[PDB]
Amino acid sequence: SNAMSSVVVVGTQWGDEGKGKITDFLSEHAEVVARYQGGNNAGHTIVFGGVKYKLHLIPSGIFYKEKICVIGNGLVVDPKALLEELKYLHDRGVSTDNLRVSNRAHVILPYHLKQDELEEASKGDNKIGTTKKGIGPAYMDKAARIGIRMADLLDREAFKEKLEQNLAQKNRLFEKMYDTEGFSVDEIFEEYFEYGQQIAQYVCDTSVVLNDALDNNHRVLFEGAQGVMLDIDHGTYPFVTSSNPIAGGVTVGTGVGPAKVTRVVGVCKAYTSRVGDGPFPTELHDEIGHQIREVGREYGTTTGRPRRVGWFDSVVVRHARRVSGLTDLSLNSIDVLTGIPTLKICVAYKCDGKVIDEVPANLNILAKCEPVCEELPGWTEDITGVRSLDELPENARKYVERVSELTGIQLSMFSVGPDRNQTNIVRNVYE
Amino acid sequence: MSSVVVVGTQWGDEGKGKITDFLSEHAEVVARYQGGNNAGHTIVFGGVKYKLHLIPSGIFYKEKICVIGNGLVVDPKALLEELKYLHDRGVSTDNLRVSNRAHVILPYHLKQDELEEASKGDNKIGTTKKGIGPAYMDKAARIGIRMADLLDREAFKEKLEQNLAQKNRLFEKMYDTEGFSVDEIFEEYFEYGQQIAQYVCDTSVVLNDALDNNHRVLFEGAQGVMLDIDHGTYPFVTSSNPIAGGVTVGTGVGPAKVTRVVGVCKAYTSRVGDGPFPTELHDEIGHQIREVGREYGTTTGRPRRVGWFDSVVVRHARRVSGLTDLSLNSIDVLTGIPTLKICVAYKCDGKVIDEVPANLNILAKCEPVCEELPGWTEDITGVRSLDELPENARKYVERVSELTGIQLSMFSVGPDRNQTNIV
Ligand SMILES: Nc1ncnc2c1ncn2[C@@H]1O[C@H](COP(=O)(O)O)[C@@H](O)[C@H]1O
Ligand SMILES: Nc1ncnc2c1ncn2[C@@H]1O[C@H](COP(=O)(O)O)[C@@H](O)[C@H]1O
C-alpha cells in the first residue's frame, strides 16, 4: 500500500454482531489477519469453497495460502481445541503453513475448564453465564502471574515444573474450597505436551510479525471477538468476558503501538442480542422478539440454546464509539427486521425517571435502566439481494440512516444477509 | 492533536517523572492509565518537593485536569492519605477525576499479596506488597469491587460479604491463616469512598472531550515495558500494561488518538524486584552506579539491583510500545568509570540473539554481549546540551541512540528540572 494500512474490526454490542463475515470480507484484501484477545469462546461459521467451517481460535484469513494469520499474545489458547480446529481444516484440504501463534499467549488447561464451572455454580443466581471454556480462570492465572504460556508449553522441563507448581495450588483449591477432585500433573503433561509439539511449528514472536508487516506497508486486519459491551473494563461488568474486545485491545494484545491503527470498524447488528446473563435494557419477550430470533437464527450453533434479543440500542453504540474510537460503521442483519410494521430504536435510558445518555458503571443502576425509544415504520420487501442504499425500500434506508445519525458514526458497510456476498460497501476502509 | 504518552522502557525506574514533569507544563490533561500506588516520584513545584503515588503529576496546576483512569487499581485509604497530604500543604485537588470503573484495593488484597509471595518461596516475584496483583486477579475473576460499587452503600456491603466469604475460606484453606470480618472493613472503607465521591465520573468522557476539542493530553505511565504483564519478563512483572497501548484500554480511548510515545530509559539499568536481569552488576562498578544514582527504596532504603545499559530491552520496547522518541536519563551516574559497556545482544547456549526470549528458562540463562566504550572523569551535571559534554560522554549517548534505533528527544544529567535538556 501507499502508506500504513491497519484496520480493526470490533463488535459494538454483546458479540454476535456479525463480525465474522465482515472480517471474512475485509480479509480478501488484507495481507495479515490477527486475533488479539479472548480464546475459543469466539466463533463464526463460514462456507468457504462450498465447505462449511466454524473457526474459534484461528483467524479468518487462514483459507488463503498467501495471507499470514496471527494468534496474538493477548489470547488464552486451549491447545487441544486449537489442534481439533487444525485437523478439521487439514481434513478439508486447507493448509495452515501461514498460521503464527504467539510465544507469549497464555495456555488453557483442563483445570481452567473445571474452575470455570465451579465458579459459576458458586455464584448461584449471580452467575455470569460464561461459555464454560475456562476463559476467565486462564485470565485470572495470567494476572496472578502463575499462568503457563506457549513458550513454557514447548519446554519439556518448564511445562512440567509449572504444572507441578500450579496443580499443587489448584488441587488444594478443588479439594478444599470446592470439595471436588482435581487433576494429575503427569496426565496433563503427557497429553498437552504432545499438543504443544504439534503446534510448535507456528510459535514465534508475533509482535515482530505484525510490526514488520505494518512498518512495510502491508495491509493488516485485526479481528475482534466478543464485543464492547462484554469488555472487562468498559462493558456491563461483571457480566462481561475477561479481556478487552475494544480496538485498544489490539495494542496490548499483539504488541503494537497505538498510532499503528488507521481505521476501526464497529460492527453493529440492526437489533441487539446477548448469549449470557446480565442487564439488557432493550430486551424483547414478545412475538416480535420471537420473529427476530427465528429469522436471525439467534440460537447457539452447538446447543441450540436461544439467545436473548432486543431492539437496537444506540446508547450502547455511542458508548462503544467513544471507548473503542470507532471511525466506521458496519450495520448487519437489516433483513431480519423485514415485515415488522413498527420498528423501535432505543435513544436513551430512563433511570428512576431521569433520562440519560450513558451506560451506568454501577450494575444496580444499569439494571434499572428502561429504554426510551423512537419508532420508525418498517417495510415488507425481501431485501436479501439488495446491493446499495439507493436500492433499499425507503423505510429500510431511513432506518439505516437513522442508526448512523443516532450513533454519530459514518456508514461504511451494510449487510442484508448471512452470506459474505450480501455485504455492501459504502466507504472503503483501506486506502 | 497533541496526545503524548510517557512510558518506561526498562523495569520501572527510568526517571519517567523528570519527563512527565517537564511535559505536564504544556499539557491540559494528565492521566494515569494502569497500576496503583506502586508508582510515584518526587515532583518539584514552585521550588517545593512533593511525593505522590496515585495522583497524576499535573495536580499542582489548578487549570489542568488530572485523571485516574479505569485501568488502575485504587486503594481508597492510600488515595485519601495523598489527598490530605496535598491539602495540608495548600494544594487544591478540585481538578482530580477518578474513574467510576477503576477497581478498589481492600485490606484482603494486601494480605493476599503477602500470602501469595510466601507460598512461592524462592520463586517469589518481589512485589511492592500493595495488593496490586490480587486486585487485578479479582478484576479478571469479575468479583472485584469498582469505584461505582464503593459509592453504593448497600451494594458495597453485599459485595464485601460475598467476597469476604470467599477470601476468608481461601485464606483458611490455602494459606492456613485468618481473614477479615465485614465489620473490620465496611464502614471504614465506605467512608473513604464518600470522601472520594466528589471526583468520581466517567473518565473516558473526560479524556475524549479533551481530545476531540484539541486540548493537549499527557498520559503518564508507571512501571516500564519489562514489567508489562504481556511483554515483560513474565512472571516477574506487574499485573498491568505499562506499554503505550495500555492507555487505550486503561482510559477508554481509541488507538489512533495517541500521537507521540516518549520512551524513557536510564543510562544504566535497574530492577527493584526479583527475576532475570541479564546485564546485572555485582561488582565495584555496580555499587558506584547504585550509590551515585541513589538507587535505594525511598522508604525502606532497600538497595536496587543495577546493571549496564541493555539495548536488547530497549529495542524490544521500541516495538511493543511503538516508541516515537527516547529520553536518556542519569548520564551523570556513569562518570568516573574507565570502561563503559552497552549490551547489544544476548548469549544463550553460546548462541547470540537479538530478542528477549519469552521462555523464562532461556532468559534466565542469557549472558550479555557487550560493546565497550571509554568513559569520562569530568563533572557533567552542569551541561545544558550534548555538545557541551566531554567527547566520551557525547559518544556514549550517540551510541545508545544508534543501537536502539530511536531518535533522542531529551537527556538528563541530574535530578533538577534544569538538568533535563532537549536534544
Ligand atoms: N463469542 C461470543 N459471542 C457472544 N457472547 C460471548 C462470546 N464469548 C463470550 N461471550 C459472553 O461473554 C461472557 C463471559 O463468558 P466467557 O468469555 O466464557 O467468560 C458471557 O456473557 C458470554 O455469553
Ligand atoms: N514503581 C515501580 N518501580 C519499579 N518497579 C516496580 C514498581 N512497581 C512495581 N514494580 C515491580 O513490579 C513487580 C510486581 O510488583 P507489583 O506491581 O507490586 O505486583 C516487582 O518486580 C516490582 O518491583
Side-chain angles (χ1 to χ4, degrees), chain A residues 304 306-320:
Chain A
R307 302 183 185 137
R308 307 157 70 187
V309 304
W311 293 119
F312 190 87
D313 184 334
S314 73
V315 176
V316 145
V317 178
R318 280 190 305 274
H319 177 83

Side-chain angles (χ1 to χ4, degrees), chain A residues 145, chain B residues 11-13 38-39 125-129 132-133 223 227 237-238 271-274:
Chain A
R145 295 156 297 187
Chain B
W11 288 273
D13 179 27
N38 56 347
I125 293 169
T127 70
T128 63
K129 299 304 180 53
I132 306 295
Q223 294 87 47
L227 293 170
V237 292
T238 193
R271 285 203 77 142
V272 179
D274 296 296

Side-chain angles (χ1 to χ4, degrees), chain A residues 143 145, chain B residues 10-14 16 32 35-41 53 113 117 124-134 136 222-224 226-228 233 235-240 270-275 304-305:
Chain A
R145 295 156 297 187
Chain B
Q10 299 157 319
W11 288 273
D13 179 27
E14 304 92 349
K16 291 182 297 302
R32 282 282 302 277
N37 50 329
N38 56 347
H41 70 286
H53 298 277
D113 200 357
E117 285 283 90
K124 69 183 202 311
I125 293 169
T127 70
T128 63
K129 299 304 180 53
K130 285 172 177 186
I132 306 295
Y136 280 118
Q223 294 87 47
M226 301 313 302
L227 293 170
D228 187 273
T233 54
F236 301 96
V237 292
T238 193
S239 304
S240 69
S270 59
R271 285 203 77 142
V272 179
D274 296 296
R304 299 170 181 159
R305 304 161 72 191

Side-chain angles (χ1 to χ4, degrees), chain A residues 104 142-143 155 233 237 242 362, chain B residues 139-140 144 152 230 239 356 359:
Chain A
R104 290 167 163 85
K142 174 178 187 182
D155 185 321
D233 287 275
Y237 181 96
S242 306
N362 183 335
Chain B
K139 177 179 185 177
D152 184 327
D230 284 274
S239 304
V356 182
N359 187 326

